[PDB]
Amino acid sequence: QRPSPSGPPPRCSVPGCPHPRRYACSRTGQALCSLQCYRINLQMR
Amino acid sequence: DVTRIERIGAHSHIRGLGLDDALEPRQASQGMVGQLAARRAAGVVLEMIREGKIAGRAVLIAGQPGTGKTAIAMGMAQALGPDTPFTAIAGSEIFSLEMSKTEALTQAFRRSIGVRIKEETEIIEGEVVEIQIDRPSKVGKLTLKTTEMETIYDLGTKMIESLTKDKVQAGDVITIDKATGKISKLGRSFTRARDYDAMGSQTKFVQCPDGELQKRKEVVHTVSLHEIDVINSRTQGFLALFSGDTGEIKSEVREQINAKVAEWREEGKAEIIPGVLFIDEVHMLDIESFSFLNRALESDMAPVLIMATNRGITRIRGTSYQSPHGIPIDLLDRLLIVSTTPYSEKDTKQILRIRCEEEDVEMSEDAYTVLTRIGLETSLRYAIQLITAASLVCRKRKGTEVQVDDIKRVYSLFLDESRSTQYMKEYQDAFLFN
Amino acid sequence: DVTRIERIGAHSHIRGLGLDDALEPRQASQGMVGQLAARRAAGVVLEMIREGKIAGRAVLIAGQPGTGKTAIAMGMAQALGPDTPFTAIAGSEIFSLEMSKTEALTQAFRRSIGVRIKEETEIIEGEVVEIQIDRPSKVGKLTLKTTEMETIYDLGTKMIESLTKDKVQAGDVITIDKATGKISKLGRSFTRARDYDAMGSQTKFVQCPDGELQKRKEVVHTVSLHEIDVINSRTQGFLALFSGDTGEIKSEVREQINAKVAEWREEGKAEIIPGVLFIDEVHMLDIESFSFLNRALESDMAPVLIMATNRGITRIRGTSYQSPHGIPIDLLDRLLIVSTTPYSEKDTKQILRIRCEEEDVEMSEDAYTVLTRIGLETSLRYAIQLITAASLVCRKRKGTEVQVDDIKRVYSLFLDESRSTQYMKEYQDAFLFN
Amino acid sequence: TQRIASHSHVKGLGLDESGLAKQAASGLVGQENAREACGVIVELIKSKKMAGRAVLLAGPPGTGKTALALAIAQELGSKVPFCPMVGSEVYSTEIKKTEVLMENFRRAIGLRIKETKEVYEGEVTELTPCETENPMGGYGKTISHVIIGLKTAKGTKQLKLDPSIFESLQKERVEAGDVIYIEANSGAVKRQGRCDTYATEFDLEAEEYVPLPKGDVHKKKEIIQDVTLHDLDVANARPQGGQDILSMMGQLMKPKKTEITDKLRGEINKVVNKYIDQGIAELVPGVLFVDEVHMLDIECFTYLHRALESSIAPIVIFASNRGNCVIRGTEDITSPHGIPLDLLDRVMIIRTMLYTPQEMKQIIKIRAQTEGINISEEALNHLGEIGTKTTLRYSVQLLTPANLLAKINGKDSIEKEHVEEISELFYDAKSSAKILADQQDKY
Amino acid sequence: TQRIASHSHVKGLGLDESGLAKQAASGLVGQENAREACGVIVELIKSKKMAGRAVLLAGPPGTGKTALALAIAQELGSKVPFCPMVGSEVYSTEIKKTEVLMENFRRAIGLRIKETKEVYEGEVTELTPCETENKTISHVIIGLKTAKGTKQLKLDPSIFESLQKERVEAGDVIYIEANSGAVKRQGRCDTYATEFDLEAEEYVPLPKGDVHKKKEIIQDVTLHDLDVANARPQGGQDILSMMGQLMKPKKTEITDKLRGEINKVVNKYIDQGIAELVPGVLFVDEVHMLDIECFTYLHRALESSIAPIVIFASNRGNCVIRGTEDITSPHGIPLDLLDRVMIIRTMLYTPQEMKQIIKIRAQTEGINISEEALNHLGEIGTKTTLRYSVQLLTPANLLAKINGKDSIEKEHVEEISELFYDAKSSAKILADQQDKY
Numbered sequence A: 001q002r003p004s005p006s007g008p009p010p011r012c013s014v015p016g017c018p019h020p021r022r023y024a025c026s027r028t029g030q031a032l033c034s035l036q037c038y039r040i041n042l043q044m045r
Numbered sequence B, C: 001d002v003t004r005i006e007r008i009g010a011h012s013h014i015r016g017l018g019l020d021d022a023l024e025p026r027q028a029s030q031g032m033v034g035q036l037a038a039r040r041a042a043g044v045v046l047e048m049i050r051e052g053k054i055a056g057r058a059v060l061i062a063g064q065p066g067t068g069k070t071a072i073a074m075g076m077a078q079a080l081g082p083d084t085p086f087t088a089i090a091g092s093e094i095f096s097l098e099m100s101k102t103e104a105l106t107q108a109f110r111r112s113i114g115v116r117i118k119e120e121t122e123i124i125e126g127e128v129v130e131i132q133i134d135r136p137s138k139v140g141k142l143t144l145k146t147t148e149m150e151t152i153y154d155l156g157t158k159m160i161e162s163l164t165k166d167k168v169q170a171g172d173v174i175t176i177d178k179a180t181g182k183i184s185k186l187g188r189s190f191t192r193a194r195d196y197d198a199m200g201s202q203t204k205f206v207q208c209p210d211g212e213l214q215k216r217k218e219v220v221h222t223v224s225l226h227e228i229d230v231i232n233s234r235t236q237g238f239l240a241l242f243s244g245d246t247g248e249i250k251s252e253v254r255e256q257i258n259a260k261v262a263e264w265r266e267e268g269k270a271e272i273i274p275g276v277l278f279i280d281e282v283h284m285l286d287i288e289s290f291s292f293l294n295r296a297l298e299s300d301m302a303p304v305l306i307m308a309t310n311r312g313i314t315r316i317r318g319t320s321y322q323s324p325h326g327i328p329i330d331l332l333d334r335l336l337i338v339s340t341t342p343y344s345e346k347d348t349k350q351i352l353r354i355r356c357e358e359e360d361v362e363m364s365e366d367a368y369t370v371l372t373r374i375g376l377e378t379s380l381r382y383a384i385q386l387i388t389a390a391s392l393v394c395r396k397r398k399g400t401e402v403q404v405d406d407i408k409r410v411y412s413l414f415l416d417e418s419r420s421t422q423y424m425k426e427y428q429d430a431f432l433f434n
Numbered sequence D: 001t002q003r004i005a006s007h008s009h010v011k012g013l014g015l016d017e018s019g020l021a022k023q024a025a026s027g028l029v030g031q032e033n034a035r036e037a038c039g040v041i042v043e044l045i046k047s048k049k050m051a052g053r054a055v056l057l058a059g060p061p062g063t064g065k066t067a068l069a070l071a072i073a074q075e076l077g078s079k080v081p082f083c084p085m086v087g088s089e090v091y092s093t094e095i096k097k098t099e100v101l102m103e104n105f106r107r108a109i110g111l112r113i114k115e116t117k118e119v120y121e122g123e124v125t126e127l128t129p130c131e132t133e134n135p136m137g138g139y140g141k142t143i144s145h146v147i148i149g150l151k152t153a154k155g156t157k158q159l160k161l162d163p164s165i166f167e168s169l170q171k172e173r174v175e176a177g178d179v180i181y182i183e184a185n186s187g188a189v190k191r192q193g194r195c196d197t198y199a200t201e202f203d204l205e206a207e208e209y210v211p212l213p214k215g216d217v218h219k220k221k222e223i224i225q226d227v228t229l230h231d232l233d234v235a236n237a238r239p240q241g242g243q244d245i246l247s248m249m250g251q252l253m254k255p256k257k258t259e260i261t262d263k264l265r266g267e268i269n270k271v272v273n274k275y276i277d278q279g280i281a282e283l284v285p286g287v288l289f290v291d292e293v294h295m296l297d298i299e300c301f302t303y304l305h306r307a308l309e310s311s312i313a314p315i316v317i318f319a320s321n322r323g324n325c326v327i328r329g330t331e332d333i334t335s336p337h338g339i340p341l342d343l344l345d346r347v348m349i350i351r352t353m354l355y356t357p358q359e360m361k362q363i364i365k366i367r368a369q370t371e372g373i374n375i376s377e378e379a380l381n382h383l384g385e386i387g388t389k390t391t392l393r394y395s396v397q398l399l400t401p402a403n404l405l406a407k408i409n410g411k412d413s414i415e416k417e418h419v420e421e422i423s424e425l426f427y428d429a430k431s432s433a434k435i436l437a438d439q440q441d442k443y
Numbered sequence E: 001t002q003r004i005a006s007h008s009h010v011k012g013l014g015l016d017e018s019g020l021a022k023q024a025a026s027g028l029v030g031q032e033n034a035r036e037a038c039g040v041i042v043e044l045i046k047s048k049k050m051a052g053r054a055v056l057l058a059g060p061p062g063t064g065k066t067a068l069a070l071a072i073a074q075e076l077g078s079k080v081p082f083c084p085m086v087g088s089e090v091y092s093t094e095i096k097k098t099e100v101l102m103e104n105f106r107r108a109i110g111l112r113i114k115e116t117k118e119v120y121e122g123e124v125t126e127l128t129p130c131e132t133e134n135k136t137i138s139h140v141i142i143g144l145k146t147a148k149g150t151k152q153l154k155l156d157p158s159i160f161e162s163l164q165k166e167r168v169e170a171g172d173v174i175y176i177e178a179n180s181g182a183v184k185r186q187g188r189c190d191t192y193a194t195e196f197d198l199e200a201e202e203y204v205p206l207p208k209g210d211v212h213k214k215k216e217i218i219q220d221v222t223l224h225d226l227d228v229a230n231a232r233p234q235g236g237q238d239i240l241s242m243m244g245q246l247m248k249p250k251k252t253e254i255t256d257k258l259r260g261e262i263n264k265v266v267n268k269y270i271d272q273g274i275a276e277l278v279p280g281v282l283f284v285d286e287v288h289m290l291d292i293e294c295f296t297y298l299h300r301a302l303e304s305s306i307a308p309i310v311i312f313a314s315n316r317g318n319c320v321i322r323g324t325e326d327i328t329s330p331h332g333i334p335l336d337l338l339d340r341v342m343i344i345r346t347m348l349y350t351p352q353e354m355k356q357i358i359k360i361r362a363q364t365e366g367i368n369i370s371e372e373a374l375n376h377l378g379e380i381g382t383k384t385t386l387r388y389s390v391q392l393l394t395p396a397n398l399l400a401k402i403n404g405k406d407s408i409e410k411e412h413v414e415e416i417s418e419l420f421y422d423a424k425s426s427a428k429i430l431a432d433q434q435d436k437y
């Protein structure tokens, strides 16, 4: 039988952005959609 | 010093066709002088091509040999602009042993009709830093690097099965599409592939991709109508597309193509761009082709036709008849004829001055009188060869500028067709099959 | 209201030659009228074909255009009977770019001869009770029910593979062949299929059979020598029969097939029956096919053939000399000529009267005078078309009886070839290639 | 929008109720005799009483016989098929001319078959191996049926299937949430793909995600598919199934038109006769059109006799713009209209005549209103003088450059100076032909 | 029974022991000089010591040239291969016109070959493959059970591939040969038919005799069949031979190297004495239809040392050569080939000799004709042609069967001759109505 689906979708690191995650980042250890928000995440980390 | 695949040519010295808001041809525009009515009508039919409101129209150009039919044709083609479907084929190119002439002309009319479509896609293309998997459902991740950023992807079981099935290793530049799921291996990195002492039979070096790793964007793809025919006729349409092996295509598949494209036009997704089909030396052609051009013009869709005839009256091959332009009278009224005028001795000096800039070899004002005398008394192309062949003799003389003695020398080296006929009459008895 | 694949046609209304037991021609019978000489000769060739004791004979028919030369061949074709093979080919049909003309002639001669083979097989037909299969070779049982007797049989490996390949489940009426091994499902039972699984598949239903389960049936078939030669030449070429891709079959295989068929006739398991080959407008056939036909007709398996010639005293294609009927003297003297007498005025009225019963169109007595006069001045075919379109306009006027004004209307709508030539002479200067 | 076609302004014959041809109808003026004759021809096509009928259309070039022949299909509608074929397509390298004409005869006629379909589709909520209790000493465990759940936006439904299909469900990959295609009549089970709902859990996955079908779980709908006898002849000519190695390799080979034997034609006629007797399939006749008939070979001319004498031959129309000419294939043989007397006697000839200058002006006005171009009175008179001097076709071609140049000059309507400049720049066929005579020595 | 053939009544040349031609023998009358001329030709073909000989037959149409060719074919016997050919047959789209003429020689010359074959056949009790490390099958172990005894043998992986190709299972009777390597399957034994009440496989009884049997098989094959077998790999145990077996058998040209290799291996077979070569006879009818290029190749073809004897048939006189467009040559044969060929003169039949042909053919058709109808048929035959009176035999018999008469009568012959039209009368009628044609 199919398991219960996860209700919340994954979201972007910088939370003015959040969208379904395009990729995960190992250095910052957080998921990001685009390099734009990736600059903010890398700067914050 | 670097030489491209393109080199100087007869029609290659002109780029673009100059016009005005009133469609008044300039005296000298983009290396073209003369033919006021021809250039003006060429601008009218050119704006007609840009409009593309109607289809199934044929334009025949008429005039003496050497009036620049191909010159004004190529000028109109270049003035039309790029990304416009253009097919110019000789009258003898349609003859093929594998394909029938009806299929040759048919594909000639089909290939010149383009379709512009819009499609949005998302692609992930980058250089793989690392690959790691764990099998207990196997879970694994891969590390990718780009100039802007580096990031990791966690992939599923079957997504691992694709890379392991392709024997993908770390250090390779690849492209991954999430929607389709296919993996495209571009190559390996320079520094990573440098470690190997030798490389395999199939390998390539690609630079590290720059920009966003995962790009979601809309792209407008321009497709041609001839491509879809082979793809819908055979399972593999690209193999016979590049191979040219396909032949004798059924008309029902073509009708289904026109119906589906009409459905796309009704959906408004893609818009069709008209195109140009140019045929030179049409005076010699099959009467079956002349009969097919009737329905070719009466078809619902068809590219604009531009045809050139270099002979006033010539017997059509296969039958005995005398008709103008070597074409039947039934098809003679379907053509829009544009007459031309021979070039004046005054304009010869001007077009020769334009041809001097192509070779960048300066000529004195006294040489244009002799070279123009040869371009007048004899064919112009002979003199166009006399200047180029004379520049070499000038460089043999180590002079900075050509002289009349150069045109006299090359004129003594090369003879006109009439002169070669005169000597061929004296020695003709010695020649075979006189 | 239902329309078959067949529709009314010129020669389609003929049901036979209209001959008596004495073979003497009857004036009006079986849709044919007049021409007692050619009707009697057609009776001679029909009785000769029904005799079938002589082979390798050629019969030629000649006469004026419009004398019914094709109507006689269709008369004997319909009067010959369904069980006797008949083949009608045209001179332009044997011309093909895939295979040679002589090979097409061999396909015609070997195609005309029919072969009748009878087969007796014992099959099992009944309603399935239950189906059981055990897979470890798989061994299972099949229980069947009929109104007369209920049976239980055991299934083997190949039988279980065949039934499982045919998707056979309990509750279906099937037919199994013991010797052949084929299984064909006719349908399902109403009561046994009344209670079904929730899948709810609705396809077909067949009542339960009665009588003995295993019965012996006789199914007769006919195979062409060309069909056998293609099948055995292509090495399991059953698809090449309908595909038509086969060509240029080796002669040794044909000889071995002829010898093996002769051995079959000696065994009595298979019987050989003669057949007819009809050729229309043979005068256009190349002289090479004539030279091959004269020597190829001498074979024992060569069936009797019938040719028709429209014209006479005309040069053969490929030769510059004229010959009678466009045929060389070797073949023309090799076959018998049957001349057709042109029809008279009295017969035309009856020919036009046949269309009244055939097309179910009531014709007035006053219409046969003007219509018969049109039949005298013009072609009887144009008279028949005048009858059809005259009936169309008669329906347009909603009348039961034909009126002369409607025939004048059709005569005003359509013009004779001579009239179209008369106007074509006035407008001929404007016409192309006059 | 749709590109304007030269004949696109002809919407049909425009017949009246009594059968007479109105003067101006459906953009057609004049030719009352031809429009009425074709008006009877379409009654023959709708009547379907006769077969193998061959009509001929003769006349000077530019009389509109092609517009009338194409108007026949527009008047008949989309129910009956229409197959225009030029005589140039008869000559072909791979396929012989007789096979071309035969395949055209099969292209004209067509069929329509109504069929009902029952399909189960949706997301799979659960899959259970329902176990009835029947313990036996011979075999321990028993499974009565397998339950397959299906979920759709409109509703959810569970199905009880025999366990035999679970062998295929276990034979091919089936996961929870896989959208699958299952037909009740065929009984086969196919896997469409993974549902779009689960695509959010993984950033990368090899399986493509198809959306869940919107609709009822059980979909039973009746559709009527139209298939021509030519399509039936091709499908019967080559196997569509690629399970065989010879079918796979032959599918890899380049397709070429193959000569079809008469046996397959007869089998198609027999099965078609059976389905007509059953009444499930509807048969409609086609209308074959032929242009440039004077281009055919004498072998084709003689072949058309045996082709037309058959009862399966659809109605054929011919178009000939040539007068008395030499028959192709024979040097010394001359026949009126370019057709031999044998076939010319069988075909029904229809005469066409050239238009008067007034009809030229009216046709020019119709084409102007069709292309959306305005013409002034005096310029229409001068244009009518030009057309009367040379031809109607040239005067029709003169409309576009005067419209474009008029828009460039800023005048929304065509003027006599515009058609005068256009007539000055462009040259008519006869004028160019006369100019070629003086310079012919230089050519 | 056998269908009646036009030449069926001709049993040969009808010559005595001295070589002279009898008046009526072997269903042939007249042509004493032609038959006597062929009496030496049959002694040449039977002598076999000469090759590259061509004999042309010159005569009017209907004089029995083809009857003389088929008469020689029946005189030489069934062992001597006789290949008929028509001038229109050499034209083919698949192969060149020369390749046909070159292949007609190999098809003309026959070859008799004796082949000693060792046969292993019987019921298969057990079959197992061996397993060897590279999971590959190195050897095969198959036992054979027969009524005489049981013997276990070992087979190769190729033979095993042919067995799995034939779907061979335990308990079936198969046929295995060594030198050829092919594998056949006879069927399942009849003993196992009782376990299943219904089975698709047919059952054959268990064969008798020893498993291994060496036997001699004498087969007659043609050098053209050998040339096609060596030309294309249609037969064989290879999977590519199976794919080519599925492919269409189009004709292809044979290389002179392959032909010379065939001459080498057949020459070795003759040196071994196991194979016996016999010469053939190539017949060409309607030679005037052959192209001047075909004659040009016939120059070297007839001059070849291995070329079998060729007979030609020419029914026409002076005519334009095919393809020359200008030069006309006697008998449609150019002077170059016509100088090499040997010409035989044929004469028209006399009015007295025609009636005997009409009577012999009337008896061959099984018809009883009275002397009056025989004299009338002979008279009209001499008036027009012999072929006409030959064709008038059957329909008059049909009218006799209709009217119930046991024999043909002058009213039957008169009615048949009234219905049918002669070529001369028809050609005369075409003149008056020629304007309507």
Ligand SMILES: Nc1ncnc2c1ncn2[C@@H]1O[C@H](COP(=O)(O)OP(=O)(O)O)[C@@H](O)[C@H]1O
Residues within 6 Å of the ligand: B009, B010, B011, B031, B032, B033, B034, B035, B064, B065, B066, B067, B068, B069, B070, B071, B072, B351, B381
């Ligand atoms: N108006 C022009 N201006 C410049 N060059 C021209 C002109 N007309 C013709 N030419 C040149 O003349 C050369 C030969 O032209 P050609 O192809 O013979 O003309 P046509 O096809 O009319 O005979 C071309 O290479 C072209 O560059």
Ligand SMILES: Nc1ncnc2c1ncn2[C@@H]1O[C@H](COP(=O)(O)OP(=O)(O)O)[C@@H](O)[C@H]1O
Residues within 6 Å of the ligand: C010, C011, C031, C032, C033, C034, C035, C063, C064, C065, C066, C067, C068, C069, C070, C071, C351, C380, C381, C384
């Ligand atoms: N014996 C006949 N009985 C009835 N109709 C005939 C007969 N002979 C000819 N016809 C009619 O004459 C028409 C034209 O015949 P046609 O095919 O031109 O004859 P032919 O083939 O001898 O030229 C046909 O439509 C046919 O219906």
Ligand SMILES: Nc1ncnc2c1ncn2[C@@H]1O[C@H](COP(=O)(O)OP(=O)(O)O)[C@@H](O)[C@H]1O
Residues within 6 Å of the ligand: D006, D007, D009, D027, D028, D029, D030, D031, D059, D060, D061, D062, D063, D064, D065, D066, D067, D321, D352, D363, D366
């Ligand atoms: N009666 C008419 N009314 C309007 N347009 C016509 C008429 N007759 C012909 N045309 C136009 O003339 C064009 C060419 O006709 P064409 O096919 O040459 O006629 P034909 O086949 O009789 O020579 C067509 O595109 C059609 O639109």
Ligand SMILES: Nc1ncnc2c1ncn2[C@@H]1O[C@H](COP(=O)(O)OP(=O)(O)O)[C@@H](O)[C@H]1O
Residues within 6 Å of the ligand: E006, E007, E010, E027, E028, E029, E030, E031, E059, E060, E061, E062, E063, E064, E065, E066, E067, E315, E357
């Ligand atoms: N001498 C003969 N005796 C008996 N029958 C003969 C004789 N010559 C010819 N015939 C018969 O005449 C028929 C026609 O001969 P044909 O083959 O046309 O001669 P040719 O080949 O010279 O044209 C043959 O079937 C043959 O049986």
Ligand SMILES: [Zn+2]
Residues within 6 Å of the ligand: A012, A013, A014, A017, A018, A032, A033, A034, A036, A037, A038
């Ligand atoms: Zn973001």
